Amino acid sequence: SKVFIATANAGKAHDADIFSVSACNSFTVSCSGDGYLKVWDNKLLDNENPKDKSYSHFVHKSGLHHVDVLQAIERDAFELCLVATTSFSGDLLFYRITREDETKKVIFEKLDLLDSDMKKHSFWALKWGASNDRLLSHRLVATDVKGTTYIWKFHPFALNWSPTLELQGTVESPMTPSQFATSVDISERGLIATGFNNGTVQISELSTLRPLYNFESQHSMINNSNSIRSVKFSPQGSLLAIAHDSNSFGCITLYETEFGERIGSLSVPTHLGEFAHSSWVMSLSFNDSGETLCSAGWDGKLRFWDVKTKERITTLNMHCDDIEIEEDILAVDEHGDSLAEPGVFDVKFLKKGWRSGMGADLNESLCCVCLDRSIRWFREAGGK
Amino acid sequence: KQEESDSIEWFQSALRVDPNDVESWVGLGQAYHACGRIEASIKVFDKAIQLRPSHTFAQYFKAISLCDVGEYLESLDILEKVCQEAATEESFQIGLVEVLMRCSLDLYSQGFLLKSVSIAKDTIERIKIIISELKCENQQVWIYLSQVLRLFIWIESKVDTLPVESLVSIFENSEEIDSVDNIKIDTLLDSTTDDNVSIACKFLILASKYSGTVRASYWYNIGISELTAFITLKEPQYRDAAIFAFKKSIQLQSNTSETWIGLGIATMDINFRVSQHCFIKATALEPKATNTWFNLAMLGLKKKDTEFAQQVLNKLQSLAPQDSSPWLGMALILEEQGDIIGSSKLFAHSFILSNGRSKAAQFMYAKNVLENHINNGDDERDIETVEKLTTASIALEQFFKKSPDSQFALQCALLTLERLHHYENANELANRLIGILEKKFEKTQDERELFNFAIIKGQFARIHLGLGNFELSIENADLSQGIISESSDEKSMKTKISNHICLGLSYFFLNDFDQTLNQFQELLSISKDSKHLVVLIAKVLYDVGESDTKEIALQELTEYIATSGADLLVTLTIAAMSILDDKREDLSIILEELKALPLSKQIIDKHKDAPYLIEEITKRLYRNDTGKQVWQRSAYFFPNNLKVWERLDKNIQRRIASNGQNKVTAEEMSKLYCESKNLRSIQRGMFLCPWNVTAVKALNECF
Amino acid sequence: SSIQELYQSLKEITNNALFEDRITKLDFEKHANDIIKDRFLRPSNALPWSLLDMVQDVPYKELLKVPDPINRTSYQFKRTGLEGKISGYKEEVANASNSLSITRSINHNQNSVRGSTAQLPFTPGGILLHKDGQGLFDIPEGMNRGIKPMEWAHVVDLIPNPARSWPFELDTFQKEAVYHLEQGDSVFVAAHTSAGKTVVAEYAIAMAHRNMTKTIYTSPIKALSNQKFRDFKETFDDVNIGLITGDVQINPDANCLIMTTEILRSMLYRGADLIRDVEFVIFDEVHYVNDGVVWEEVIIMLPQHVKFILLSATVPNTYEFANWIGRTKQKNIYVISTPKRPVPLEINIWAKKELIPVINQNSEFLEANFRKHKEILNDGPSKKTWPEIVNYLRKRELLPMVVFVFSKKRCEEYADWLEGINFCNNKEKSQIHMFIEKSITRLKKEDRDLPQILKTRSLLERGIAVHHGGLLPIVKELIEILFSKGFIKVLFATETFAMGLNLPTRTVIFSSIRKHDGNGLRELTPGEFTQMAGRAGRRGLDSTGTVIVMAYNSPLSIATFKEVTMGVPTRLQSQFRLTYNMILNLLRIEALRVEEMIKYSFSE
Amino acid sequence: PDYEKRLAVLKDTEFIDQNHNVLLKGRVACEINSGYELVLTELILDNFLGSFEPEEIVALLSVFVYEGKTREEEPPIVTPRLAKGKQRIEEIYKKMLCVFNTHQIPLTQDEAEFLDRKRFAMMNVVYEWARGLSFKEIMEMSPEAEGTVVRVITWLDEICREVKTASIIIGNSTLHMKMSRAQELIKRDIVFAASLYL
RNA sequence: UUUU
C-alpha cells in the first residue's frame, strides 16, 4: 500500500460528530451523535452522488458512538444482515437490514434479543464475531463501564426466522478495584482482548473464558495518563496491535499472542521519544493480508506502517477543501474554530470487490470519517 | 552431472513439447533452485503439485524453497503433512528438523525469544524420535542439535526448560580430547552440585563429539563448542580442549579463516603475540570479514594500547559503518580517555544500530543513561529525560531475558524503576537480587558482603514504602540501620538518610506512632539540612497536627530561610501553612512578599501557584475584592500559558491548546470540550474520556 | 455519586416521537482548604527525583563474536529409469557481504527490490604483507606498527506453439524477431515509429511468463513509463505487471516490471534479489541522445543469465553497437532493420493560401513545384494565418492536425489566435466536461482552481489544446488521454510530444525548421525531422500522411530544405562517462577494477 | 588519462589514500548519486548544518537540482542562515574548482558555469513550500513555470533520501531526524499527485 | 531560447 486515490466523499453527511464507521459487502454504515444511522450503497455507478444512494434511520435521542455490521449467508439461499449499535445512554440495539423487491429501498427492522436482566447494564464497546471455522455459531462480545466482558451466541433459527441471543459467560477485570473497559476485539483463532483506562490489556480464551496474559504498556507510572484506545488482532498472524496514549502523544505497541511478549513500537520524528502520532491515535486497521497497518490520528493524518520492518510507508493528509461539491464544505465549526486539518475518528479497510465505482473493482479500498462531519473513500492504485 | 544451468533450456524445450510432464517440471524446478532462482522454482513446484497432487517429493522441494525465501509457516505445514503421509523416509524427517532449526534461529535473530525455545524443544523432541525409532545417524542431525542447544545457553532465563529426559536417551542410543575436558555421559549422570548452565554447556559438548574437509569441520565444531563453554564458565580445561581441537583442525586444513579466528580467541590472555598472529592470518585469508578487525581491536585494548585500537577502529568504521561494534569500541576508548559527550553519542548510536541484537549495547546504554541523569538536577516534567529512562528500562528488560542474575544490571534496573514509579517490577527484581546475594555470601562465608547488604535492604525498604507495605519497609529499614551504624564513609550517609526517611514516613502513614516519627525526623534534621528535605519534614510535622510539631516545622523552615536565603518553594509552603492557620499579620506580610517576586522567580513558576495564592489571600482579607489583576498581568507577560486563561476566558484556553500550540492531556482536553456547554462538544468530551464524571454528568443534565 | 450512579441515571433517557443542538443545565462553576492541602501540604508515598538525587548512588571476552558452525555435507537425488522419478538419495560432501556469487544466501530482512550498499552486487557477465619477526606476524596490513603492551553479431536480410497470437498477419521483421527470440538469444530491431515494435516486447513478456520468469522494461524518459504501464495493463490478461519509481512501488511481485534505466542501474550496483529471476531486459528508445541515458553501464553490469531486446529507430550505426554488446557479454544478437512505413508521407509547402507538393510518395523531389513556390511568394506567422489554414484543412477534411512550435510561449500565443473556431458538438462537450471533472477529483478545491487548469478546460471544450514542458504533469496526462480518445482536432506541441506516445493524426505542420537548443539557433537535424514528420498517418483509417512546411512571405532556401528533409540520417553516439561516484563505488567493492571497466567499452 | 587525473584529484582531497583505499569521506560520497558528490559530502561532513532547521536544509539543497538558467533578478534571501549556507557552498565550490584546474581535468558546461548562473533563485520557493503555502502562492512568487517547480521538488525528495543514508553512515542522528521530517514535509498535494494512468 |  503506497498510493491511494480518492474516489468519492460526502461532506456534511451527518448533523453531529461521526464517531464510528463499519462496512459490509453491500453497504457502509455510519453512526453519529445526532442519533441517526446511515447506510451508503457500495455499488455506485459512474457520475452518482454518494448521498443519492443513502438511507437513514433514527435510533436513539442520546446519539450513537459504536457500530458493527454482520453479513452472512446462513442457509442455501437465506441471507441475513445485522447492525448492532450502542448509545451514550448505554443501550445495546439490534437491527435487521433488508431491501425491497421493486424499489430496492432499505428497510429497518428492530430486534429484541436481550432479556430484562441484561438491559440493566451500560455497554460501551462491541464487536461481531463471525463464523470462521472455529465454531459454527456467530459470536458477540461487549464491555461495560464496570470492566466486565460479556460473550453471547447468536441463533438466527429456532427455515424459520426467530433470532435469539444466548449468554456464554463473563470475564471480570484483572485488577482490584475494577477499571473502565474501553476497547475489545475477537480473533479468528478464538481469543479475546480487552483494553483498560490504566494501560493494561488482558487476553482470555474464547472457549473456556479464563485469563491468559496481563501485560502493561505504560511508558511510566508517574501520571495517570496512557489509556488504551484501540486493540486489534492481526487477520492471520499471532499479533496484537495496541494504541495507547502518552501524556499528549500517541503510541502504538506490537505484541505476539502465543506467549505475550513485547515486540516493538512504531514511531516517527515529530516536533524526542517513541511516538507514532503528534496528538493521539484513535483507531487502527489491518489490511486483508495483515502486512500493512493504518492508524488514524487526532492530528489529522492517516499513517501507514510496514508490520515486519516497523517503518512508516506513507502519509495521507485530510483537508476540508477535499469535498467535491463545494456547497458541502464545512470550513468552520459552530464556534468558528478552524477545520482545515480535522482529526480522524475512525478508519476501516474494505475488502476487494466490496466497493465499486471509479476504477475500484480489483483492489482494496479504504474509508474514514473525520471531524468536519464527512465520510471519504479511497482506493489503492494498481490491482491484485 | 551437477551442471544445472545447462539443463534449464532442455527442460524448457521438453515442457514446450509436452506441457503435462510432471517430471520435466520437477527437473526444471530443481535446476532453478541451484541457480539462485528460488521464486521461479517455487512457482514451478506449485505448477507440478497442481498437475499431480499426490506427488510427494515436489512438496518437500517446495518446502525447502519456501524456507530459503523465509516462509516458515507454509513450509512447516507442507513438511508436517508430508511426514504424516510417509514417516519411513529419512530425508523428509531431516528436512523437517532443518526447517524447525532455521525458523527458531530466525525468530531468535528477530527478537522472538519466547517462541525460539519452544521451537527448539520441538526440534529436540523430533531428533529424539528420529534417533529412537528410525535408528538413523548422520552428521547433519547432530549439527542441527548443537545449533539448537545454543539457544538454551543464549536464552539463560529459560534454561530450566531444557529437555534433560529426551537428551539422555539421545545420548544413550548411539579419546584424545577426553582426557582434558573429562566430559563423559557416565560422569554427566553421576554428578552433583552442578548448576543448570554448566549442565547445558556439557550437553552442548556432546553432539560435537558424537558426529580432510569433514574431519577439519568436525574438530572445528568441537573447538567452537569448547570455546563457548570456556567463555560461559571460565575454567582452564575448556580452554585447553579448545586449543587442542583448534590445533588439530588447523593441522587438517589450515586454509580457513574461522579456525584462525577461534585460535586467536582461545589464546587472548596466555599470549598476545599468538593472538595477533592468528588474527593477522585470519584477516589475510578472508579480507571481507569485519569481525577479525574488531577482535584485534579488543586484543589491543586488553593490553592497554589505545592508539592501535583507535586506528583499527577508524579503519573498521570506514569498512562496516552499519555494524554496532566499532561504535561500541570507540565509545569505550573515549570513556577511558575522559570525553563524556562524545562517549554518550557513540553509545546511543551503537544502541540504535544494534536493534536489540547486542547485550553489551543495551547494558552500556543503560549505564550511560543512568550515569548522565543521576545527579543532574532535572525535573520530572522533561519529556526527553523520561523517554530516555523508559528506553533504558526497556533495554534492561530485554537484557534480563538473556543474562539474568547480574548484580550490576539488577541494581541499575532497580534505580531506573524507582525513578519511573514502577514499584511492582522493582519488588521482584529486589527479591531476586537479595536471593543472589544471600546465595553468594552463604558459600564463601565472608563478611565483606555486609556493606552491600545494608544498601540493598535500604533500597528494598524504599520499594516497599513506594508500594505501600509499611511493616516490611520498617523491618528492612531497621535491619539496614542495625547492620551499619558505626561506619563513617561516603556510601553510609546516603543509606542512613534513606533509612531515616523510610522509617519516619512509614510510621507516620499507618503506625500512628507520631512520637517515633518525630524522633526519627528530628534525628534526620540533625543529620542534614536541604530545602526539599526540610520542606518534606515540615509538611509531615504539620500533618501530624500537634502544636509543638507545627511550631517546630515553622521554626525550622524560618531557620533554613535565614541560613540559605529566599526560595519560591519554601515561601509558597509557608504561605499555605499561614492560610491554613489563619494568621492575619503573617498573611498580610506574605501578601506583601508574594506580590513583589523577581522575574526570575516568575519564569520558573510555570504553573502560576503564586498568582493563585495571591488571589486566595486577597479574597480572604478584604471581603470580596477582585484579584483578577494578577491574572491579567500574568497573561500580559505569558499570553501562551494554559493556566492564566482559565480565570479570564475559556474560549482562548480551548483555542490555544486545540491545534498543538501547547501539550495537553486527554482528560484536560475533554474538560475543555465539556466546558463549552454544548451537546456536540459534550458528546465529544465524553467520547474522549468516558470515565470522566463531569462529562457524563453534563450529558445527563442536557436532556 | 460514582460513575456507576451517573451511568444508571443515563438509562432513564427515553426515546420519544429532527436533531436539536441542546444546552446543558449543569453549572460548572469554604472548601478551598482542600485544594491547598492537596497541593502544598500533602506528603506522598512516591519519593520525587529531588530526594532520589540525595539517597541514590550509582553502583572483553563477552564482547567478541564466536564464529558459527560449518556444514559441508548435503543430499543428492538420483532418479532411475525412463521418465525420471526420484529413487534414492546419498549423503555426499556465503552471505551478501562476503560473496559475489548468485548462489549466496538470501537475507529476508532487506528489500528484495531496491537493495542496500551493505550488499555486494552480483558478478557482471562476460567481463607481500608478511612482516614477520622471529617467526610470528607483528604488523597488520595497511599500518606501520603492531601492539605495544602497556560472441558475434549477425545481420538478417528481409513457432508451432506461439506464446501469443494476433488477428492480423505479422510483418516479416516481426516474424524474424519472434523466431530469433524463440531460439533463445537476443535481437536488435531498428524500424520506423508506430511500425509494430511493441509486438516483439509483448511476445517477450509472454515468453517470460510461460517459463515462470520475469521481465524488466526500461525507457530513458519517466513520462513514457506511465503510458506503457497503462498500455500493458489493457493489453495483457493472466499476467500481472508492476511499476517501479524512485519512491512508489506498485505490484513488486509482478511478472513484468516497468522502470527507468537509472533505477535499474541503482538496483544492479546494490545487488537486489530481484535480478535473480529476471530473464529479459528491454531497452526502448535506444536512439535517444540528449546532452539518465546510462544504458551502456547497465549492459556492462548485468549478470550472465539476462538476455537483451533493444528497440530503436532507423539509424545507420546499428551493427557497431550490436557487435560491441555481443563481444562484451558473449551473447548472440541479431540485427533486424526495416524502412517500410504503413502510411506514405507527402511533403507540402504552404504559401499564399496554396498547398504545393514538393516531395511525392516515392520520395522524389519536384523542382518545378519549388520554382512555382519561389516565384509565387515574390518572417513568422501573423494574427490571421492560423485560422486560414485551419479553415482550408476543414474544407478538405484534413483534421486532426498537429503543429510543432519550439517555444513555450508561442504555442499558447498561437492557440489564442484561433478564437471563434469550434470543433465540438453538444454531446462531445458534455463528455469532455464529464471526463475533466472526473479526472481532477483527487485534488483540492485550491488545486482545482489553478489558472492553468481553467485555461486548459476552456480550450479543451472546443477541440483545441497545447502541449509543452511548462505544464503540470496531470494537465499533460489529461491532454494526452483526451487526444487519444479522438476529441482534440488542433494541437500545438513541442518536442515533448514527438517521442513514443499514442498519436492518431492525419496532418503534421512545421512552424519552422530551426530549433534553438543549448547555446545558439540550429537547423533541425534529419533524425529529428524524420521522427516528428513520421507521425502524420493513421494505419487503416487514413490513406496518406500530409506534411506541410510553412513559408511566410519569404521563399525557403533550397539548400537547408534539402539538408533537413532529405539528407544523411543521424548516427548512434556513445554517452558513456566517468564519475567520481562510479570510481568510488568500484574501489569500495574491490572487484571489477576501473581500468577493466573502461577498456570494456565502445569508446575504447 | 582522465581516470588517472581523477584518481589524483581524489587522493589530493583525502577521499582516498596512497593505496587507493576508500576513506570516510569516500564512503559517504558513495551514497550520493547526483552530479555533485564531493561538494555535498564536504557540506554534510562537519557540524555546519547543526543549527539549521529541516526547512532550511531542504531549501538549501535545491542548488544541486536547479539549472539556474533564468532571466530575472533574484529576490533577497528569506533567512540569514540560507545566505550563510550559500556563502559556504560557494567557497567549497571555488576550492573544488581550484583543485580541478590544478590537475587539468576537462569540465562540463554545467560544472564550469556553476557560479556564473542563478542556481540559488529557487531557495525561497522550496522554503515556502516546506512551510506549507499553497501552490497558487508558490507559483505567484516563483521565477519559473509549474513544471520546473514540480521537477525541483521531485528531485529534492531523492536528495533527502540520499542525505538520510549518508547521515546514517557518518554517525549523525540529528541530521537523520531532520531529513526524515523534511521528507515528510515536502511530499504533499498536487506536486506528488497520483498519475492519471494509475 | 527546446529537452531534463
mmCIF file of C-alpha atoms in Angstrom, chain C residues 154-246:
data_model
loop_
_atom_site.group_PDB
_atom_site.id
_atom_site.type_symbol
_atom_site.label_atom_id
_atom_site.label_comp_id
_atom_site.label_asym_id
_atom_site.label_seq_id
_atom_site.Cartn_x
_atom_site.Cartn_y
_atom_site.Cartn_z
ATOM 1 C CA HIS C 154 24.687 -11.387 -37.154
ATOM 2 C CA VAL C 155 22.696 -9.437 -39.747
ATOM 3 C CA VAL C 156 19.497 -10.885 -41.234
ATOM 4 C CA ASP C 157 18.193 -9.864 -44.659
ATOM 5 C CA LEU C 158 14.449 -9.332 -45.048
ATOM 6 C CA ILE C 159 6.831 -21.394 -33.921
ATOM 7 C CA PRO C 160 4.430 -24.343 -33.648
ATOM 8 C CA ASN C 161 3.032 -23.219 -30.272
ATOM 9 C CA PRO C 162 3.367 -19.422 -30.148
ATOM 10 C CA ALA C 163 3.201 -17.743 -26.753
ATOM 11 C CA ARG C 164 0.890 -15.057 -28.175
ATOM 12 C CA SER C 165 -1.378 -14.700 -31.197
ATOM 13 C CA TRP C 166 -2.714 -11.696 -33.099
ATOM 14 C CA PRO C 167 -5.634 -11.294 -35.523
ATOM 15 C CA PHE C 168 -3.703 -9.589 -38.323
ATOM 16 C CA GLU C 169 -0.833 -11.187 -40.225
ATOM 17 C CA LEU C 170 2.580 -10.271 -38.840
ATOM 18 C CA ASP C 171 5.234 -8.358 -40.754
ATOM 19 C CA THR C 172 8.397 -10.070 -41.962
ATOM 20 C CA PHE C 173 10.622 -8.361 -39.391
ATOM 21 C CA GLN C 174 8.189 -9.159 -36.569
ATOM 22 C CA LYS C 175 8.233 -12.838 -37.562
ATOM 23 C CA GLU C 176 12.038 -12.827 -37.743
ATOM 24 C CA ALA C 177 12.310 -11.219 -34.299
ATOM 25 C CA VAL C 178 9.822 -13.674 -32.781
ATOM 26 C CA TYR C 179 11.659 -16.654 -34.277
ATOM 27 C CA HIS C 180 15.045 -15.447 -33.043
ATOM 28 C CA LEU C 181 13.653 -14.782 -29.559
ATOM 29 C CA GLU C 182 12.145 -18.282 -29.530
ATOM 30 C CA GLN C 183 15.507 -19.789 -30.488
ATOM 31 C CA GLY C 184 16.818 -18.353 -27.217
ATOM 32 C CA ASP C 185 19.062 -15.346 -27.823
ATOM 33 C CA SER C 186 18.994 -11.581 -28.369
ATOM 34 C CA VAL C 187 17.626 -9.312 -31.105
ATOM 35 C CA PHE C 188 18.241 -5.688 -32.125
ATOM 36 C CA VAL C 189 15.329 -4.232 -34.114
ATOM 37 C CA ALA C 190 15.577 -0.836 -35.842
ATOM 38 C CA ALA C 191 12.331 0.231 -37.529
ATOM 39 C CA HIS C 192 10.193 3.320 -38.034
ATOM 40 C CA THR C 193 7.971 4.536 -35.217
ATOM 41 C CA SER C 194 4.466 3.048 -34.993
ATOM 42 C CA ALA C 195 5.502 0.197 -37.305
ATOM 43 C CA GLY C 196 4.738 -2.506 -34.730
ATOM 44 C CA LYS C 197 7.775 -2.836 -32.467
ATOM 45 C CA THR C 198 5.505 -3.399 -29.441
ATOM 46 C CA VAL C 199 4.639 -6.871 -30.781
ATOM 47 C CA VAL C 200 8.208 -8.008 -30.061
ATOM 48 C CA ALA C 201 8.039 -6.719 -26.480
ATOM 49 C CA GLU C 202 4.639 -8.343 -25.923
ATOM 50 C CA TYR C 203 5.909 -11.684 -27.222
ATOM 51 C CA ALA C 204 8.992 -11.446 -24.996
ATOM 52 C CA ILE C 205 6.799 -10.768 -21.950
ATOM 53 C CA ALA C 206 4.531 -13.701 -22.840
ATOM 54 C CA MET C 207 7.545 -15.985 -23.316
ATOM 55 C CA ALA C 208 8.940 -14.985 -19.922
ATOM 56 C CA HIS C 209 5.559 -15.551 -18.260
ATOM 57 C CA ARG C 210 5.347 -19.014 -19.837
ATOM 58 C CA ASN C 211 8.738 -20.025 -18.391
ATOM 59 C CA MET C 212 7.925 -18.705 -14.876
ATOM 60 C CA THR C 213 10.444 -15.860 -15.064
ATOM 61 C CA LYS C 214 10.258 -12.052 -15.073
ATOM 62 C CA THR C 215 10.837 -9.146 -17.453
ATOM 63 C CA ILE C 216 12.113 -5.589 -16.999
ATOM 64 C CA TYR C 217 11.014 -2.801 -19.357
ATOM 65 C CA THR C 218 13.186 0.325 -19.264
ATOM 66 C CA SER C 219 12.975 3.683 -21.027
ATOM 67 C CA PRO C 220 15.121 6.804 -20.514
ATOM 68 C CA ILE C 221 12.058 9.067 -20.064
ATOM 69 C CA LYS C 222 9.841 8.853 -16.984
ATOM 70 C CA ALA C 223 6.786 10.175 -18.846
ATOM 71 C CA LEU C 224 6.651 7.075 -21.063
ATOM 72 C CA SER C 225 6.601 4.702 -18.075
ATOM 73 C CA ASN C 226 3.027 5.532 -17.042
ATOM 74 C CA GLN C 227 1.744 5.265 -20.616
ATOM 75 C CA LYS C 228 3.460 1.904 -21.093
ATOM 76 C CA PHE C 229 2.076 0.704 -17.755
ATOM 77 C CA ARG C 230 -1.468 1.565 -18.845
ATOM 78 C CA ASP C 231 -0.916 0.018 -22.289
ATOM 79 C CA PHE C 232 0.351 -3.272 -20.857
ATOM 80 C CA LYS C 233 -2.419 -3.283 -18.242
ATOM 81 C CA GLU C 234 -5.015 -3.031 -21.009
ATOM 82 C CA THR C 235 -3.266 -5.448 -23.384
ATOM 83 C CA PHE C 236 -2.360 -8.301 -21.049
ATOM 84 C CA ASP C 237 -4.542 -10.936 -19.397
ATOM 85 C CA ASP C 238 -3.443 -13.622 -16.904
ATOM 86 C CA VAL C 239 -0.123 -11.777 -16.360
ATOM 87 C CA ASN C 240 0.322 -9.015 -13.784
ATOM 88 C CA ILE C 241 2.569 -6.004 -14.360
ATOM 89 C CA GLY C 242 4.168 -3.564 -11.948
ATOM 90 C CA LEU C 243 5.759 -0.126 -11.949
ATOM 91 C CA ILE C 244 8.911 0.870 -10.057
ATOM 92 C CA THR C 245 9.689 4.549 -9.481
ATOM 93 C CA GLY C 246 12.067 6.419 -7.199
#
